[PDB]
Short mmCIF file of N, CA, C and O in Angstrom, two decimals:
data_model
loop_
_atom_site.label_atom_id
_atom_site.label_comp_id
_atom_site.label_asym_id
_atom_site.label_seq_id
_atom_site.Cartn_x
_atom_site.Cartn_y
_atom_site.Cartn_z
N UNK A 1 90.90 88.07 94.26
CA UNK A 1 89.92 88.81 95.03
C UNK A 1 90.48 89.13 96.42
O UNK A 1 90.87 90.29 96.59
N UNK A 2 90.55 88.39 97.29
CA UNK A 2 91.29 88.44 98.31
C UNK A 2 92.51 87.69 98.64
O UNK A 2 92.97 87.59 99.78
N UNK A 3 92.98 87.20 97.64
CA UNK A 3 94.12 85.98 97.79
C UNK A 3 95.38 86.66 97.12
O UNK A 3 96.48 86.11 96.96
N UNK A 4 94.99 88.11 96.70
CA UNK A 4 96.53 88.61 96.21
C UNK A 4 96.64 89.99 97.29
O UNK A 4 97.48 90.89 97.34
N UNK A 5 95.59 89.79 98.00
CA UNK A 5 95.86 90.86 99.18
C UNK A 5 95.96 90.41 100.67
O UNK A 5 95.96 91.12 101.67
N UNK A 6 96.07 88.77 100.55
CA UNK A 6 96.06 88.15 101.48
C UNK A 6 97.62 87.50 101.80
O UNK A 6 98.12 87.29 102.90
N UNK A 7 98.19 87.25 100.47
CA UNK A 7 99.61 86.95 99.61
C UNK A 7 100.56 87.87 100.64
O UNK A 7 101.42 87.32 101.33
N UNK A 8 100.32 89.45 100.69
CA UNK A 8 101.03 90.08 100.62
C UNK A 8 100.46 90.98 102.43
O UNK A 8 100.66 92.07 102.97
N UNK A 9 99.94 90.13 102.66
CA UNK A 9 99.03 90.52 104.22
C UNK A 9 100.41 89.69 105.16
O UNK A 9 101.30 90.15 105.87
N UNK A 10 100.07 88.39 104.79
CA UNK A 10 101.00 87.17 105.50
C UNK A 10 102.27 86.83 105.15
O UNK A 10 102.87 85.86 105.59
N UNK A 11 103.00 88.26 103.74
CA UNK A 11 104.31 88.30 104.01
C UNK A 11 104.95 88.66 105.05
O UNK A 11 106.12 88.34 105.24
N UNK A 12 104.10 89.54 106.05
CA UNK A 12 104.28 90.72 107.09
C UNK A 12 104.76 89.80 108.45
O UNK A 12 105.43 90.21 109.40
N UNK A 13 104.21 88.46 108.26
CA UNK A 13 104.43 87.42 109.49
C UNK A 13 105.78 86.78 109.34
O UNK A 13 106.11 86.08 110.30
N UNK A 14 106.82 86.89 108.16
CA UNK A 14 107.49 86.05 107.82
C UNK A 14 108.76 87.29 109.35
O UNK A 14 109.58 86.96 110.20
N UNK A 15 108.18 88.68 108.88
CA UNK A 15 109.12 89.20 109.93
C UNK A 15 109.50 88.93 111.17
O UNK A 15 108.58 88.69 111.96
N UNK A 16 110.20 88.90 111.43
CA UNK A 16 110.25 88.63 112.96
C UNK A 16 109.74 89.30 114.12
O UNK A 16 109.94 88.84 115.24
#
C-alpha cells in the first residue's frame, strides 16, 4: 500500500 512506494521514496536518501 504504501510500503512499496515508501521502499523506493527512501532509496532517494541513500544519495548523497
Amino acid at each position: 500500500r504504501q510500503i512499496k512506494i515508501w521502499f523506493q521514496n527512501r532509496r532517494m536518501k541513500w544519495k548523497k
